[PDB]
Point group: D2
Chain length 239, copies 4
């Protein structure tokens, strides 16, 4: 099975809770040395210490992905601690339903958060994945980059931009041996309203962050060695 991450160094952003924490833990179990980062230093340090206790190699840092100070800090810290960069999980991001008439300061924020930060991070990491022989980029998107709904003028445009950025920079950094893929998570179990939302999920249950973690582990692994420019929706079969 080429589903292990041995000799891998994986930078996981927004990885103190939820999908990022699960991705970091599962990647570490797979043999990858994990640079856990978050907007909060305390959560990232906690997750990294938990990983080290489990028997893995990890460090914990504070990173605001929108701050190039912090981005170069994370890149340099990964290089100092582990010597190379081979996996970049851009899970950091946010945004939500904003009105059509929103202040433009919110529209620009949605793209500086969900898109600009991760593109700059991929720019920063791609050269180090090149003398490393190749790497894997994984941007964690959302199901709003494909679906059309109200109040999604900022979030949805940003997530679809993430998707097509994946599909396109698959072509630029391919020669570097780098694979760009994305994961679109659905409803994650971090109640008649819950069952009403399950009525459109054919598998009859909500997803666990382990689902996203395993999809990511596949996409970042040598098993996905000839997979690039792909958005994989983990939704149980619906919206």
């Amino acid at each position: 099975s080429p589903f292990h991450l041995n000799d891998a160094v994986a930078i996981v952003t927004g990885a103190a809770a939820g999908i990022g924490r699960a991705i970091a833990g599962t990647f570490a179990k797979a043999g990858a040395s994990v640079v856990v980062t978050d907007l909060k230093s305390e959560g990232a340090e906690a997750v990294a210490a938990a990983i080290r206790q489990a028997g893995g190699k990890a460090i914990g840092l504070e990173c605001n992905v929108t701050d190039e100070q912090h981005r170069e800090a994370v890149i340099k810290a990964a290089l100092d601690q582990f010597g190379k960069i081979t996996v970049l999980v851009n899970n950091a991001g946010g945004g939500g339903p904003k009105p059509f008439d929103m202040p433009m300061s919110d529209f620009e924020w949605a793209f500086k958060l969900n898109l600009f930060s991760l593109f700059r991070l991929s720019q920063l990491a791609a050269p180090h994945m090149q003398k490393a022989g190749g790497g894997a980029i994984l941007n964690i998107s959302s199901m709003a980059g494909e679906n059309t709904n109200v109040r999604m003028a900022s979030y949805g445009s940003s997530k679809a931009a993430v998707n097509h950025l994946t599909r396109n920079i698959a072509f630029d950094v391919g020669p570097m041996g780098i694979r760009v893929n994305a994961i679109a998570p659905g409803a994650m179990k971090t109640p008649e309203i819950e069952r009403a939302m399950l009525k459109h999920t054919p598998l009859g249950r909500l997803g666990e962050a382990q689902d996203i973690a395993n999809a990511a582990l596949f996409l970042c692994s040598p098993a996905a060695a000839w997979i690039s420019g792909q958005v994989l929706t983990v939704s149980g079969g619906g919206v």
Copy 2:
């Protein structure tokens, strides 16, 4: 024939040359009063004067769509000259192939020009279209919003963002009686041409009047129940 634009006021950005100029002319022939705008005052004024000579109502303005001063100026000038806003054709834009290692500022410029400008323009124009009993917005995207290619890190992401912005803000301004659609133009007329036509099954390149008539359909009462759609005018292939 509900393919006329009588009692219509159409703002057309980047309309001194090419697709925008042909859209302005075709919309004026359809009976619409056209606020031609451009980054260069002289071209917009020339196109507007030619339209007025041909027998239509038009004005010409300088507008950097990235400048909110210019945007409010165009909105107020349209409301002064013609009393209402019913059609907004965001043809203004640009960018192109930039390297993956491009300076970020390039990546922010691609979106401020190709996305943020037209979203702020739609924001400014939506209340007046609602007041005027509804209207139509048409974003002039590019085929890079769908295709995947090299050097398209910023252009492709911005264009797919325009596509999904169209699809989604069709839902917000729908209740206002506003339809949002987008045109993706192929290769435009203005042995690699033979590769172009190896791809284009119709064996010829497209004239700006093709995009003009597609826009005229999408901004006319004949498309009164069409919104959230991206029409690709490529002759049936990719160039």
Copy 3:
């Protein structure tokens, strides 16, 4: 102003009611000579007579699109009265929610009715459009060729096949001067809190009239769409129903 239908002969299949009748009538107003066909001859004859009453050129025929005898009859038919074929609207189709364990003959039926019929009709009509100088093929698909939902194992597959067949045979009959486009209609109008519930997902706050699909088709089969081919236009008011 290329939205006029002069010197055109359109074959509109399933043109007795709804989208088909609206398409036949609006094409005839545009100046096209309309071969109205339907599964029944009385409905097609009623629509054709009504178009001739409006002041258009129209004939009415019985056609089961799955019967090649009927297909050849319709081609020869229009061909004998008008002399040419320049437009082909494949609106004739059917099917709906069938279970996953459906009898496989039902599954073959979905494709024979919604796909094999219109592909054979396009095959027959391409030489004459070619011969004419140019032509237009418009396949009336469904929003189920794109959307994913229960009980659509046969209908959704067939309509997605229609969509991609459009996109690809746009490459084949391109050199003939023929354009292949598709229309995906939304919810059509023909104290309804379920109707308002389905309107909650339609941003324009109303249901679409058959005239909307009629005008969209008219555009796509018009000289104004002269450089448009291989495209599926969804007329849904901006949502899903």
Copy 4:
């Protein structure tokens, strides 16, 4: 780890050589009892006994998926041999460029081979996956179900129909605990025109059948337990033209 298939029974169709052969050999390493089937008994028997020699559980039967004779035969043979059905890999397909003016006996072929077959197969397998507590159906499709090209009147329509049939019957058999996914492979390794097709493949190399085999293993494993109605393109990041 959930990248296994212990306590699994797999019906792979089209596995004398290529993607199906790799899928049968790789699913068996995951511990799955594999029912290797194909058009010729010789190749399916050969592959099946090779999975046996390595240490897996397998058999090799004749199956022409357009023949309901063989269709029920493989269902009842997998139950005879292993007792349950939990995984169904529909790789058996084929076809290619045909003229626009083709007969109905080429178009109908393409659809009875690429689509009707795997649908009847999924129909047959679904009640046993329901009986066995859920399972995975995996249709092998094509990049022509997304991309447009000349002569693709029958191949492209059929594979796009496969894509959408996946996306839709994900809703039908979901309640049964079944996940339906699809793989779209690129150019498979089995030259300078090769470098010309590689100029559109960013990873600068062609794909091996093990790539599709491992994407399939992921898509039919417990690690993809909440993934359904998806089409995964294994293409190296681009399209390859032959």
